[PDB]
Amino acid sequence: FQGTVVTPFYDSLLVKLCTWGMTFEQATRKMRRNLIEFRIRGVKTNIPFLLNVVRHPDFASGNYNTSFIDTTPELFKFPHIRDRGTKTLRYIGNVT
């Protein structure tokens, strides 16, 4: 929740996000949107990784198994953050 302090002692879990559809594909579209729509600032999250999983066509297909993640190194390439906001605030902060 906004204002919480995550500690290192227990699980990191912030929220379990679940999506439903009449079909798996419908549920998949929603998982994608919702993962992207989340805004969480002050700590890093695993969302970039979940998105990679949920967008990967092996996931969409429904044919994956125990080894999928461990043998799919594309899942560990991440887009560069766009943090134009944050930079703009550093500038404003600095002149101020």
Partner 1 sequence: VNGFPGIKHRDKPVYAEPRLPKIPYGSQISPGTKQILDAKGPEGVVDWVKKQEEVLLTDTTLRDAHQSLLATRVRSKDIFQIADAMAHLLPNMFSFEMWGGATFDVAYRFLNEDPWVRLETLRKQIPNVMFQMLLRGANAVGYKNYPDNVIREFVKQSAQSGVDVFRVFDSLNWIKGMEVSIDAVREAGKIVEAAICYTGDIDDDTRTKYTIDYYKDMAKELVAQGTHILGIKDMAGLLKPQAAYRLIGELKDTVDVPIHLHTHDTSGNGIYTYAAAVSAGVDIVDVASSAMSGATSQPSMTGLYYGLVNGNRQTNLDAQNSQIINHYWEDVRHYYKDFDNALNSPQTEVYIHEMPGGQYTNLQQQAIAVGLGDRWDEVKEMYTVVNQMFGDIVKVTPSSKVVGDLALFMVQNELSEEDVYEKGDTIDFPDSVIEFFMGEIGQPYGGFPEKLQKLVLKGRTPLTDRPGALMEPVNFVEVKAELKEKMGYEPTEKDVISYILYPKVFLDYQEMINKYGDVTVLDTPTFYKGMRLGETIEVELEKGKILLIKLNSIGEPIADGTRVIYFELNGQPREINIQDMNVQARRKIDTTNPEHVGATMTGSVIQVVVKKGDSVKKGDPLLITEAMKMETTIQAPFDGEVSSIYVSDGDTIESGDLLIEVNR
Partner 2 sequence: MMNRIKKVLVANRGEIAIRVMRACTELKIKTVAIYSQEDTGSFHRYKSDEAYLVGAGKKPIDAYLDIENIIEIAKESGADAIHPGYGFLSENIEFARRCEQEGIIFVGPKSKHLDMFGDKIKAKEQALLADIPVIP
- Contacting residues toward partner 1, per CB under 8 A: 1, 3-4, 7-9, 42, 86, 89-90, 93-94, 96
Residue 42 C-beta: closest distance to partner 1, Å: 8
Site membership for partner 2, residue 9 (CB under 8 A): yes
Q: Which two tokens stand for residue 8?
A: 């290192």
Q: What secondary structure does DSSP assign to 23-69, as a single string?
A: SHHHHHHHHHHHHHH----SS--SHHHHHHHHHSHHHHHT---TTTT
Site membership for partner 2, residue 18 (CB under 8 A): no
Residue number with CB closer to partner 2 (41 or 87): 41
Residue 39 C-beta: closest distance to partner 2, Å: 18
Q: Identify the burial level of 7 via C-beta atoms within 10 angstroms of its C-beta, where 0-12 means exposed, 13-18 middle and 19 or more buried.
A: exposed
* Among partner 2, partner 1, none, residue 67 binds (CB under 5-8 Å by kind): none
Residue 40 C-beta: closest distance to partner 2, Å: 15
C-alpha angle with apex 83: 11 to 40, nearest 5 degrees? 30
